[PDB]
Design a protein around this ligand. Structure first.
Ligand SMILES: C=CC1=C(C)[C@@H](Cc2[nH]c(/C=C3N=C(/C=C4\NC(=O)[C@H](C)[C@H]4CC)C(C)=C\3CCC(=O)O)c(CCC(=O)O)c2C)NC1=O
Ligand SMILES: C=CC1=C(C)[C@@H](Cc2[nH]c(/C=C3N=C(/C=C4\NC(=O)[C@H](C)[C@H]4CC)C(C)=C\3CCC(=O)O)c(CCC(=O)O)c2C)NC1=O
Ligand SMILES: C=CC1=C(C)[C@@H](Cc2[nH]c(/C=C3N=C(/C=C4\NC(=O)[C@H](C)[C@H]4CC)C(C)=C\3CCC(=O)O)c(CCC(=O)O)c2C)NC1=O
Ligand SMILES: C=CC1=C(C)[C@@H](Cc2[nH]c(/C=C3N=C(/C=C4\NC(=O)[C@H](C)[C@H]4CC)C(C)=C\3CCC(=O)O)c(CCC(=O)O)c2C)NC1=O
Ligand SMILES: C=CC1=C(C)[C@@H](Cc2[nH]c(/C=C3N=C(/C=C4\NC(=O)[C@H](C)[C@H]4CC)C(C)=C\3CCC(=O)O)c(CCC(=O)O)c2C)NC1=O
Ligand SMILES: C=CC1=C(C)[C@@H](Cc2[nH]c(/C=C3N=C(/C=C4\NC(=O)[C@H](C)[C@H]4CC)C(C)=C\3CCC(=O)O)c(CCC(=O)O)c2C)NC1=O
Ligand SMILES: C=CC1=C(C)[C@@H](Cc2[nH]c(/C=C3N=C(/C=C4\NC(=O)[C@H](C)[C@H]4CC)C(C)=C\3CCC(=O)O)c(CCC(=O)O)c2C)NC1=O
Ligand SMILES: C=CC1=C(C)[C@@H](Cc2[nH]c(/C=C3N=C(/C=C4\NC(=O)[C@H](C)[C@H]4CC)C(C)=C\3CCC(=O)O)c(CCC(=O)O)c2C)NC1=O
Ligand SMILES: C=CC1=C(C)[C@@H](Cc2[nH]c(/C=C3N=C(/C=C4\NC(=O)[C@H](C)[C@H]4CC)C(C)=C\3CCC(=O)O)c(CCC(=O)O)c2C)NC1=O
Ligand SMILES: C=CC1=C(C)[C@@H](Cc2[nH]c(/C=C3N=C(/C=C4\NC(=O)[C@H](C)[C@H]4CC)C(C)=C\3CCC(=O)O)c(CCC(=O)O)c2C)NC1=O
Ligand SMILES: C=CC1=C(C)[C@@H](Cc2[nH]c(/C=C3N=C(/C=C4\NC(=O)[C@H](C)[C@H]4CC)C(C)=C\3CCC(=O)O)c(CCC(=O)O)c2C)NC1=O
Ligand SMILES: C=CC1=C(C)[C@@H](Cc2[nH]c(/C=C3N=C(/C=C4\NC(=O)[C@H](C)[C@H]4CC)C(C)=C\3CCC(=O)O)c(CCC(=O)O)c2C)NC1=O
Ligand SMILES: C=CC1=C(C)[C@@H](Cc2[nH]c(/C=C3N=C(/C=C4\NC(=O)[C@H](C)[C@H]4CC)C(C)=C\3CCC(=O)O)c(CCC(=O)O)c2C)NC1=O
Ligand SMILES: C=CC1=C(C)[C@@H](Cc2[nH]c(/C=C3N=C(/C=C4\NC(=O)[C@H](C)[C@H]4CC)C(C)=C\3CCC(=O)O)c(CCC(=O)O)c2C)NC1=O
Lengths: 177, 69, 164, 257, 164, 164, 177, 177
């Protein structure tokens, strides 16, 4: 919808004023790591076959009662539709990363999930345990400290990149609370 | 074949696959000093370290007692 | 769910007419298998506890191969988990041969099955070695009559023609 | 080389004079050997129009059982009048205006390319066969419940957000102050109210979906209007994202409704 | 509002997938133009209160029939509010140079402009005069660089091609 | 073909509009990326027979069980088909570098490859183990640039996270 | 649909061969002139509303019978439908210029357009002069020879696209008449 | 080419790469004192099978309660899994000498070893006592001050690399401390 290029134009529509050399310097630094942002989504799309897979096993090996008789993901009609519930939130977060803001995420998908989840009976309590399994593996692939797959990048600092992806997943728990 | 042994307990630490996997490296130095040698070559092959039951028997029997629990 | 009754009761409503006399002829055909199919349900319900072992051991003889690392059988877990896995498919043939259709299988067993096996890397060709071993095992003189041998053996062939 | 020469075949089209000939002999000589492939590609796209209308009913009949979506009858013989109204109007829509002829064609070759999400084999079929693209839309837009009969409101305001757009959507029906023949109730002495008596049955029981059937249809309609009308109109997407019945009642075709 | 990289992700969920490898090739190209275009935004930024009154009375130098009554341009505070109507068209044409695309243009400069200029009888030919009055004097090596000089006018004539 | 040129004209065609300059930024990103992408494809056209032989030897090293009867490698004529099945991928990986997008891959090789591999009992676990050996032992300063070793290796793991 | 990069591999797919340095150099010169190619389609989109409004009266200035009663171009609607007809077949040739291949107009605009014009009685002797008029204006913009408009371009020759733009215009009238 | 060397280990499937006579000069220009470094890592991997035998046996020789029934060096498959693990540190800290940095040692080997060993019943104070033998064993091989066997080197000093590997074994020790 609107990007980080437009995020200062969000404010500038209600200024009765413009954006010039007062706010370009906050956008000038976005170009200086514009190679870095395009280099730090190339890790996220590189393991799309291990982002939604180990997430849903991360809650089975902690709370295994969800596949018990009396479960929400009991049969294959439910849990194959759980891996589609957990993949499209990896989809609308990677659109938000190239935009620099959650304007794609917070209106296309997460605009009121507490009338599609409490209307179904989905367990919200271990949905957020299914969130931080992917967040802890998102910051672990931003850095090259993943114990399985190393990635060849140009050297430099990406703590501003690693802190930003944690600050995308935080409002997911807010959208279900 | 291996077996299983798998009390999912370190399951989520080392997983089923990355378990006892390690690098392995070989060194052939050049033959004489300060001359270029085409025969000098160096492996860096990743290889799974095996269980090695054979020298496990001769080390337990040479030190303590039966080991048959 | 799919059965003799619920299938033919749908077209009465979905075309907006009464119960006909042709659908009344259809439940009459369910009586001719009611004392002919349900003997296999009480057969295996007192028989699974020894055939969950010999048909669970049947696939690993074919695939000793899955067992080692990087694959489906990586650890015990799939099997202690793996034996629980195969005790859901013919747990449903006790549910399928008691109803009269494939209802407990086409909505609980195959729906979404190929999608949780590609992502979680479970080889579907070992289930073809798991319960079709019981198809090559079945004795019509000793175990149960040839009416189970035409109906219990049919519902298995529904599944191999679904997980492939 | 084959023979002493290679002349063209007399079975090739456009081989005779057609200069100062009679009307009977002019038309016989322009359609010399073209009649076969015109009738080959006439039963081709009609079979395509028969094939995709089957492949979307498989969702309507999952694993061999009929859902509440079929429901062509409610009272004794309540499909016989629905039989006539669906097939008599199909002739009424085949005697339309010559402006709406290619308006139907070029717009069916617009929305289907959008809905066929980047599959080069599929857009090559939609350009040659206009009957396939007329059947691709109404099959998929009824498979995913998006048009008019299943996107019921849940708030109190959305009944006027429906009512604001549709009577403004019926600018497409009335050209001026006259009506059109494309929007006709029926033509029998009861067929006017016989269209109404089914029209309340189909809206009522379709409001009795499951919790999964409404929560999966309330997002499929949103992205439907988000790539058919509001390609960049973020204000129209500001109502299309949270209010899906707005994003569904507006129809992508010039349906003359 | 459609810019360079909010468009290619509006089509990336339109198929229901992730970003591709060519999806990142698009985002490299505005980085090739996020220096040559942001100088053109700065030239409008520190000169806008000089060009509102420069091209403002330019159109009043064209049309003498507005200067007599019978129009909405009789008294002074209309012409003061006319110079307000200049300032909105420079507020959002400055915005598009920041984001790269024709995003802010199509929303509140292009769409809906027909009703409140034709039922309100304020002619669009009177607007395109002062739009071109900014366009017919781009001093390319003086005010900006050579590449800002060609794309600043390319946003100027967008309201030319739309409104007139 | 899903290339960056097609994705920006298909959204341009759907809006009924002209080519706006917002898409022209994405075309500028091509000619910057095209030099660091074509020599990944030019080096692949001169090395394809030596890389496709060296790939399949790790397919049978990670899974040596396929030489058993009933598997997909019991006789010589389908081990010859295995090298042809994997050469067709690494030709479509060459084809998509020249286009720049993922166009030829997800349409020719990928779309329809799931429901024929489980049909003919072919695992994808050995398919992804063929290219992951190819994608790993390739030193980014030794064969090509530091950019083509990023972009081309971003195409090989596109297969792995679409097959798994 | 099928752009220039897709065209060079679709005639090489039937080869069952790779695409090496025999024809990539012809494509490497296509991306060399790509900066001049974006410096060509800019000259068409910038002057759209003049040149569509141009020929609709430039057609009738040669043939005044089209405004006569009983004319095809006689009323307000049949002209208002003609002007919105007018830039469709020029926005599609701009697509072919920006994508380097003529495979977007001949499947979405020349896909049976002589079929529909016979169904309405639209004349074709006027419809090919109405695009040849709008053709010379397209080579007098990519080569800066317009007499009332000048685009500041660098020093170089533009006969590379002068015949190529007209190549996307003579295929138009040939397959609609 | 150390980043390409790091991708042989971290990529979670076994590959192979080797270095000929041309690119051995690429390694000597890259790594500082590499003729001292490649002599050092050769003098650990050539005698590692003796090095694991004295490391577990000195743990028995100062703590003989491990081979008691109920002990953790009882039931010889359990005793073999010490001998598997005892070279896995020496496979990886030789690789830490080769890359010059212990980042790949940390996430692939040390990460999670503390919680694994208390899950299985490993006495951790003997586990530091095993690795401290191997810390003392490597510096007698790098400095060639081993009592039993000696190796052949060109003369000079290697005490910087002896301190460099001593900064790698306490990373193994403090991870399981
Ligand atoms: C409960 C059951 C269970 C699993 C199924 C696995 C899966 C798994 N892996 C990680 C943790 C991780 N997971 C990955 C994932 C991958 N690496 C790749 O190269 C692939 C593309 C992808 C797997 C398909 C990475 C890179 C890390 C960080 C490094 C690591 O911890 O190994 C986490 C994070 C823990 C958390 O939620 O906080 C989980 C649940 N581990 C478990 O405990
Ligand atoms: C079209 C496809 C496309 C991509 C795949 C990326 C690829 C990419 N990444 C970087 C370049 C980079 N990427 C990183 C990022 C990192 N380095 C690390 O060691 C960290 C692990 C990680 C942070 C998360 C850094 C630090 C640079 C160098 C540039 C900089 O420091 O700003 C560059 C710049 C190099 C150059 O221009 O010569 C490019 C092109 N960009 C693209 O346009
Ligand atoms: C890929 C990386 C990798 C490693 C870092 C090591 C680490 C490691 N060690 C063991 C497993 C073990 N490690 C030991 C070792 C010991 N116990 C003691 O009491 C002694 C102090 C010490 C011997 C000197 C034993 C005994 C087991 C087996 C535990 C058991 O069988 O109960 C396991 C088993 C669980 C599993 O398979 O995941 C792993 C990962 N092995 C690897 O494959
Ligand atoms: C690929 C395989 C490969 C190797 C294994 C090394 C082997 C090696 N090291 C050195 C050469 C050397 N090697 C050492 C190392 C040592 N000397 C000591 O006294 C310490 C005990 C020990 C360090 C642990 C030193 C100090 C030199 C001389 C300085 C130098 O060249 O670095 C030389 C040059 C000899 C000559 O001039 O002919 C060679 C071939 N180099 C290789 O290319
Ligand atoms: C009622 C619905 C239902 C099913 C249709 C089955 C199918 C199924 N199996 C597993 C899960 C599993 N299934 C297997 C079984 C096997 N793996 C192989 O490689 C062999 C093909 C086979 C050996 C017999 C194993 C080993 C796991 C554990 C893998 C994991 O989930 O981590 C899961 C994940 C959740 C769970 O553990 O239950 C599901 C849904 N189980 C069900 O509960
Ligand atoms: C003026 C131009 C002109 C032509 C191009 C030909 C076109 C043409 N070809 C055939 C007829 C044919 N043309 C071919 C040719 C081919 N089929 C293939 O498999 C290959 C792709 C290709 C040649 C390599 C074949 C095989 C027949 C079939 C003849 C038969 O049916 O017996 C016929 C019908 C038979 C006839 O009328 O004689 C005609 C009109 N004739 C003309 O007058
Ligand atoms: C008469 C002509 C005719 C067609 C043109 C196709 C068009 C078509 N394709 C699919 C259905 C499909 N079509 C494709 C094909 C593609 N999707 C992709 O991801 C690729 C990009 C692209 C191939 C290049 C796939 C993969 C499916 C299955 C997924 C889906 O249902 O969308 C369906 C719905 C099937 C159903 O309802 O069960 C239809 C109507 N089918 C036809 O009968
Ligand atoms: C309530 C939901 C709602 C919609 C989905 C659209 C749908 C829609 N668009 C138009 C009509 C139009 N719609 C647009 C579209 C836009 N105009 C802009 O300035 C934006 C950039 C973009 C999204 C808002 C344009 C430019 C026209 C005029 C061209 C035409 O009439 O087709 C009309 C008929 C004219 C009228 O509005 O009276 C309708 C019903 N309009 C709506 O009221
Ligand atoms: C951000 C957009 C922006 C612009 C495009 C300019 C446009 C512009 N130029 C002038 C002002 C002027 N403009 C010119 C014209 C030119 N000078 C030359 O060297 C060329 C021959 C020719 C450009 C084609 C001259 C000669 C003057 C000053 C003297 C005058 O003519 O009044 C003025 C009046 C204010 C002033 O005195 O400067 C304005 C608004 N200013 C802006 O803020
Ligand atoms: C356009 C792209 C394109 C492809 C991707 C392949 C896809 C493909 N592969 C096979 C067919 C096959 N593919 C393999 C390949 C393998 N089996 C194994 O043991 C390994 C996992 C792997 C080699 C590494 C084998 C063995 C067959 C033969 C199976 C059979 O025909 O029964 C077939 C059936 C027709 C045929 O045999 O030719 C097709 C369509 N073919 C194509 O034309
Ligand atoms: C008797 C009726 C009659 C007319 C109404 C005019 C209209 C007209 N202009 C041009 C011809 C043209 N028309 C334009 C268009 C424009 N020129 C500009 O400077 C603007 C940017 C844009 C209008 C907004 C261009 C650039 C040419 C080519 C150069 C020229 O001859 O003027 C042609 C083509 C001549 C031909 O067929 O070869 C015609 C018919 N001429 C006539 O004979
Ligand atoms: C995003 C939008 C976008 C554009 C509009 C173009 C803008 C543009 N055009 C050219 C550059 C050029 N443009 C032309 C074109 C022409 N010269 C003539 O004499 C003819 C009239 C006309 C032919 C069509 C030529 C000849 C060059 C010089 C470069 C070359 O010759 O290859 C350059 C390179 C010069 C420079 O870097 O300053 C740029 C950035 N590029 C973009 O990225
Ligand atoms: C166009 C695609 C393309 C690739 C991705 C690479 C992949 C590749 N590498 C090698 C060939 C090789 N690859 C390596 C591996 C490496 N080499 C080193 O210097 C490091 C140690 C390590 C990378 C970090 C080695 C050592 C050889 C030579 C064979 C050998 O000596 O063992 C070969 C066979 C060619 C030969 O005969 O040598 C191929 C196809 N080459 C290509 O043409
Ligand atoms: C029963 C009681 C018992 C022990 C207490 C230990 C004895 C022992 N030896 C070494 C010490 C060592 N162990 C080796 C290892 C070797 N030397 C070689 O030449 C071979 C290649 C290789 C296997 C024999 C080396 C090189 C040292 C250091 C130098 C030395 O003391 O010999 C150490 C570590 C240093 C220290 O004392 O802190 C210990 C504890 N082994 C036992 O069995």
């Amino acid at each position: 919808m609107l990007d980080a290029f437009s995020r200062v134009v969000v404010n500038s529509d209600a200024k009765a004023a413009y954006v010039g050399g007062s706010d370009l310097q906050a956008l000038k630094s976005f170009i200086a790591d514009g190679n870095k942002r395009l280099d730090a989504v190339n890790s996220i799309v590189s393991n799309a076959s291990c982002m939604v897979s180990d997430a849903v096993s991360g809650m089975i090996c902690e709370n295994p009662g969800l596949i018990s008789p009396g479960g929400n993901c009991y049969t294959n009609r439910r849990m194959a539709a759980c891996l589609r519930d957990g993949e499209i939130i990896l989809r609308y977060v990677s659109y938000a990363l190239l935009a620099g803001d959650a304007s794609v995420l917070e209106d296309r998908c997460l605009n009121g999930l507490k009338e599609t989840y409490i209307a179904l009976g989905v367990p919200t309590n271990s949905s957020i345990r299914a969130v931080s399994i992917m967040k802890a593996q998102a910051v672990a692939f931003i850095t090259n400290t993943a114990t399985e797959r190393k990635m060849s990048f140009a050297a430099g600092d990406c703590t501003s990149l690693a802190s930003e992806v944690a600050s995308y997943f935080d409002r997911v728990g807010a959208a279900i609370s | 074949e291996p077996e299983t042994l798998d009390d999912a307990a370190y399951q989520r630490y080392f997983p089923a696959r990355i378990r006892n996997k390690a690098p392995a490296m070989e060194f052939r130095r050049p033959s004489f000093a300060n001359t270029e040698d085409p025969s000098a070559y160096f492996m860096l092959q990743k290889e799974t370290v095996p269980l090695r039951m054979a020298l496990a028997e001769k080390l337990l029997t040479k030190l303590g007692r039966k080991g048959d629990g | 769910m799919k059965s003799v009754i619920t299938t033919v009761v749908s077209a009465a409503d979905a075309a907006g007419r009464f119960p006909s006399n042709s659908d009344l002829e259809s439940i009459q055909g369910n009586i001719q298998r009611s004392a002919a199919r349900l003997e296999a349900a009480e057969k295996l319900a007192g028989n699974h506890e020894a055939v969950v072992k010999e048909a669970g051991d049947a696939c690993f003889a074919k695939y000793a191969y899955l067992k080692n690392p990087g694959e489906a059988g990586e650890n015990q877990e799939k099997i202690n988990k793996c034996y629980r896995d195969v005790d859901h498919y013919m747990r449903l043939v006790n549910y399928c041969l008691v109803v009269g259709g494939t209802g407990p299988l086409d909505e609980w067993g195959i729906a979404g099955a190929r999608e949780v096996y590609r992502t979680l890397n479970l080889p579907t060709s070992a289930y073809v070695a798991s319960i079709a071993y019981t198809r090559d095992r079945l004795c019509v003189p000793r175990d149960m009559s040839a009416q189970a041998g035409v109906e219990f053996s049919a519902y298995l062939d529904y599944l191999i023609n679904a997980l492939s | 080389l084959t023979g002493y020469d290679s002349k063209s075949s007399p079975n090739f089209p456009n081989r005779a004079a057609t200069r100062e000939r009679r009307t009977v002999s002019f038309n016989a000589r322009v359609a010399r050997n073209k009649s076969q492939a015109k009738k080959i590609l006439e039963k081709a796209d009609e079979f395509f129009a028969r094939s995709v209308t089957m492949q979307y009913k498989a969702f309507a009949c999952p694993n061999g059982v009929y859902d509440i979506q079929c429901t062509e009858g409610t009272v004794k013989g309540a499909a016989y009048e629905k039989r006539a109204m669906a097939v008599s109007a199909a002739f009424r829509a085949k005697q339309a205006s010559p402006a709406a002829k290619a308006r139907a064609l070029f717009e069916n070759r617009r929305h289907a390319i959008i809905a066929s999400h980047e599959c080069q084999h599929e857009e090559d079929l939609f350009v040659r066969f206009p009957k396939l693209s007329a059947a691709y839309m109404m099959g998929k837009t009824e498979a995913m419940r998006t048009c008019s009969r299943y996107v019921v409101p849940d708030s109190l305001e959305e009944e006027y957000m429906a009512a604001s757009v549709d009577r403004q959507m019926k600018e497409r029906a009335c050209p001026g102050g006259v009506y059109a023949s494309s929007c006709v109730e029926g033509n029998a002495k009861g067929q006017a109210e016989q269209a109404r008596v089914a029209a309340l049955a189909t809206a009522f029981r379709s409001a009795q979906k499951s919790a999964s059937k409404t929560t999966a249809e309330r997002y499929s309609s949103a992205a439907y209007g988000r790539d058919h009308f509001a390609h960049g109109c973020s204000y129209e997407e500001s109502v299309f994202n949270t209010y899906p019945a707005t994003a569904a009642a507006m129809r992508s075709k010039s349906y003359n409704y």
